[PDB]
Write a protein that binds this ligand. Structure first.
Ligand SMILES: Nc1ncnc2c1ncn2[C@@H]1O[C@H](CSCC[C@H](N)C(=O)O)[C@@H](O)[C@H]1O
Ligand SMILES: Nc1ncnc2c1ncn2[C@@H]1O[C@H](CSCC[C@H](N)C(=O)O)[C@@H](O)[C@H]1O
Lengths: 240, 245
């Protein structure tokens, strides 16, 4: 079982519904989260939603008997009331996501579930070192988003529409071979717009400085491995 | 969707979260360490069978309660500082006990030796010494006329250093749970079972009322209400799961 799917599984484990009839995997990507939902609930009762067509084609390939749709979550609403709105590692990219989440709950039937997970990594050395490399190099002109709200803001936003709200924060640990391994990992986690802004011809110098900073920030354990942290916030709400 | 909702007991949330990460389909000789009145033990017997789990505790009154509730399950008295199973274990499960055992990390590494290959050590410990609840205990103690009367968990990397050599894999994670609370008094009531007792005892009977009053004021100041007026108490907890080499 993949360490990459651990947050999705931990989120789903907290969904209190024994059965789902109109469930959605929001920001489904290539169908890894969606397959977790279909495994639990059935292939015919989950619809994956995403804004990226290439994601939807991969998801549809992986799950040939499951429905998929293209939409922007900033405004999306289901055709009928949902009993499950599940969204693993998407809402960090949605502006004003708390308001979006509150509005989504109006799209749930009574007893329906909203379940959301978001990375909380902006203050981890991986992300701090991105700004440092950007601001400290000869490409710094190219560089001339928001923190996650505290748990209490999720209660304030969602409690008025919910019979139950549960919020928790977990810091997972992933041993990594070396600094190069962390840098490679983080290409899928936010390094990519930094490299884009720095420029193709600066790619090597940027990555070199960034790796040095990673090596400095993540000291080796006794076995030489580095310990990368993944802080993540989880919210589960049951609609009144 | 209302008819399909199924809520689990919130009081066993961390024990359940811990157990969910135990990669054993079957257990033949498992132990619930610091079993207490058998809440954790029943999670284990629910999953693996009443016959394959033994609860261990140093408190006789606890074991009696657990034995009454699980009458077909084994229970033994021991101090975890020194205890080893009389036969190799395939599961050593310990929810919210090891914070009370001196030099627990040394104890855990030694306990790995008592696991068979592929066996599992699973541990959860509270990590709330730096929470406002516990800080306010020190401020109350140091600030009152009783002032004269008056260990953090190691980082995840230390758990890897101690246990990885004896393991095919180790998993460490840290979770902050949030508990909405009615009011400041309900937080005070909670921590009377969560670390306030050594204070209070140290302060003396004559100072109990005054200590508690000041402590409550500090709690009221330290926990801002949510929009609905409820307070939000955090529970930081450390989880460690190791699979024997
Ligand atoms: N505004 C938006 N509307 C719909 N999908 C969005 C979106 N913003 C980001 N996404 C999608 O959300 C996904 C984030 S990657 C996370 C995907 C998956 N749920 C998982 O568990 O891994 C990407 O597929 C991205 O295309
Ligand atoms: N050194 C020690 N050896 C054995 N048991 C101990 C111990 N120190 C504390 N305990 C026991 O550990 C328990 C902690 S509270 C009970 C924890 C229970 N496993 C649960 O999931 O909630 C108490 O029953 C206490 O008697």
């Amino acid at each position: 079982e993949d360490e990459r799917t651990r947050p999705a599984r931990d989120l789903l484990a907290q969904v209190p519904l024994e059965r789902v009839l109109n469930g959605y995997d929001l920001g489904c990507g290539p169908g890894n989260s969606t397959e977790l939902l279909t495994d639990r609930y059935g292939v015919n009762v989950i619809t994956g939603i995403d804004s990226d067509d290439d994601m939807l084609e991969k998801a549809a390939d992986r799950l040939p008997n499951t429905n998929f749709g293209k939409a922007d979550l900033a405004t999306w609403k289901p055709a009928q009331k949902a009993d499950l709105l599940y969204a693993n590692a998407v809402f960090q990219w949605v502006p004003d996501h708390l308001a979006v989440l509150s509005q989504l709950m109006d799209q749930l039937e009574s007893g329906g579930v909203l379940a959301v997970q978001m990375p909380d990594n902006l203050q981890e050395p991986t992300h701090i070192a991105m700004h440092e490399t950007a601001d400290g190099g000869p490409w710094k002109d190219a560089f001339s988003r928001k923190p996650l709200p505290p748990p209490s803001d999720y209660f304030n936003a969602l409690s008025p529409k919910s019979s139950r709200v549960d919020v928790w924060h977990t810091v997972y640990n992933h041993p990594m071979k070396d600094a190069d391994s962390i840098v490679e990992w983080v290409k899928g986690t936010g390094l990519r717009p930094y490299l884009a802004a720095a420029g193709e011809e600066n790619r090597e110098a940027f990555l070199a400085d960034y790796t040095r900073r990673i090596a400095a920030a993540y000291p080796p354990m006794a076995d030489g491995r580095l310990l990368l942290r993944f802080p993540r916030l989880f919210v589960v709400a049951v609609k009144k």
